[PDB]
Amino acid sequence: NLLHVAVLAFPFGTHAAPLLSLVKKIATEAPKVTFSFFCTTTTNDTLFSRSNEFLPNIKYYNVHDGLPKGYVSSGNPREPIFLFIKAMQENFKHVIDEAVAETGKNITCLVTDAFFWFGADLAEEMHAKWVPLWTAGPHSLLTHVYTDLIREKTGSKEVHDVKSIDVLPGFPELKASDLPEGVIKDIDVPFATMLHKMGLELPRANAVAINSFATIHPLIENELNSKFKLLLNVGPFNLTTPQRKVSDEHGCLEWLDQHENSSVVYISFGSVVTPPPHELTALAESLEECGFPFIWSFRGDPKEKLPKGFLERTKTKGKIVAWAPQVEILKHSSVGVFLTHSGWNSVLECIVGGVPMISRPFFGDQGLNTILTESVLEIGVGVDNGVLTKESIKKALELTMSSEKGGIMRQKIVKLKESAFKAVEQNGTSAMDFTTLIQIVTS
Numbered sequence: 001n002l003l004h005v006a007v008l009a010f011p012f013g014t015h016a017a018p019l020l021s022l023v024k025k026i027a028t029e030a031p032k033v034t035f036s037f038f039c040t041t042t043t044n045d046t047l048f049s050r051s052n053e054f055l056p057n058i059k060y061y062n063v064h065d066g067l068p069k070g071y072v073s074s075g076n077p078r079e080p081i082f083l084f085i086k087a088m089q090e091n092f093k094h095v096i097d098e099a100v101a102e103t104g105k106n107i108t109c110l111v112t113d114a115f116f117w118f119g120a121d122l123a124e125e126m127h128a129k130w131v132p133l134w135t136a137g138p139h140s141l142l143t144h145v146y147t148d149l150i151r152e153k154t155g156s157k158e159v160h161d162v163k164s165i166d167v168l169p170g171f172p173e174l175k176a177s178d179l180p181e182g183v184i185k186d187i188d189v190p191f192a193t194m195l196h197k198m199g200l201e202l203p204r205a206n207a208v209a210i211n212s213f214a215t216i217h218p219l220i221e222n223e224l225n226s227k228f229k230l231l232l233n234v235g236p237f238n239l240t241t242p243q244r245k246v247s248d249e250h251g252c253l254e255w256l257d258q259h260e261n262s263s264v265v266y267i268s269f270g271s272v273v274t275p276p277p278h279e280l281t282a283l284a285e286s287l288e289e290c291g292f293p294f295i296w297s298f299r300g301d302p303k304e305k306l307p308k309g310f311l312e313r314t315k316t317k318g319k320i321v322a323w324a325p326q327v328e329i330l331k332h333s334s335v336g337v338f339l340t341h342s343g344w345n346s347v348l349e350c351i352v353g354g355v356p357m358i359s360r361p362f363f364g365d366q367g368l369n370t371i372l373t374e375s376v377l378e379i380g381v382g383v384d385n386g387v388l389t390k391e392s393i394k395k396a397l398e399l400t401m402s403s404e405k406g407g408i409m410r411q412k413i414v415k416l417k418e419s420a421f422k423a424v425e426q427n428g429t430s431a432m433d434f435t436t437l438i439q440i441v442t443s
């Protein structure tokens, strides 16, 4: 047993955990194969002693983060990401040498985040297979694959939201501002250059894995499939690679048990985003005004970012936590709506939970995920003008909580949820792609 799987993870956002969970699923199934997980010290330290406390064939290694000694944030929170992207290809090669040296075995398969375009070349010089994992939706991926074409049929009118573009099958016409950032807008930051190159290199992979399921959207999925040697839909991860990890220090679930069905508003804008002060106060004031019970996963100091007295004034109406057991929250019968930024993992967890969504996208692929949930799947609505105001908020809440539209939305998300469960059954489409994925990775 000499196989050695090198796993390259993106240290930012919700990328390393899902990749690790996919890897663990594969690892337990192949106890004789060696797995090496590469990420930054910080991210790896965070990834530890979870549900699967440890797997004997998984070893973690720290890739250099590209930060200068005595580094402090000043420009933007994207600064450290850019610094990481700068020397990531050479730094991953460096740290890879440590794992080969330690295990005494050469890399046979390179599993990477799809963001790592260099995987094809790296896999080639190592005489190894390349299996990239796109952690977001099939629709955003297709958009990245079509970056060059989209740029072609795009002049000034297109860039200035004048004319729209028929970029995706079964999708509304898109406005430049709707495209995942980096495709048409700011094609200059390192992030954009990384995705652009990703789009061009993926066809070289042995197979492209994705956190999705085929029936979520047949047209997009089939279109995506024809761009790669193989497209393996191994999601939704919240079903195919779940974690026993269920932390609820603040008693969110017991708190939800004391509430009636479809009555509570769950709020979370993702792992990092912090809405602007004027939006926070508008949501705060809207919450303690419409009287909906709520659980708000807040990033930062609430006594500092929220109106004075908000906490004490709503101490019985809702809970404000620094972090919450979202997957379980969304599956709880007391939740009637999910105010989200529409990150992909949150969209999939909500689909399994069967809860209508209110979306207020901030960056990346969020805008496209909102169009997907609002105009295509119709399992959620966006807020007027894409911003949170007392007016846009109250409008979205009534539509999802007290209107017939709320029911149609729940009806559709429920059909979708069932399609997901079917894809993950013993012989479902995802279970099968997952078996294929495992074979490719461990052969």
Ligand SMILES: O=c1ccn([C@@H]2O[C@H](COP(=O)(O)OP(=O)(O)O)[C@@H](O)[C@H]2O)c(=O)[nH]1
Pocket: 013, 014, 268, 269, 270, 271, 272, 297, 322, 323, 324, 325, 326, 327, 342, 343, 344, 345, 346, 347, 349
């Ligand atoms: O209070 C929270 C807030 C977020 N999450 C998890 O954080 C992840 C967010 O990923 P997503 O792709 O939705 O957005 P991102 O964090 O990448 O912006 C999801 O798995 C959520 O379940 C959670 O467990 N508890």
Ligand SMILES: O=c1c(O)c(-c2cc(O)c(O)c(O)c2)oc2cc(O)cc(O)c12
Pocket: 012, 013, 078, 081, 136, 140, 141, 180, 181, 182, 183, 189, 191, 192, 195, 363, 364, 365
């Ligand atoms: O964190 C970031 C991020 O996730 C994305 C992103 C863009 C896309 O187009 C996608 O399809 C996607 O899934 C993610 O862009 C970024 C662009 C930046 O300048 C800075 C960032 O920090 C991000």
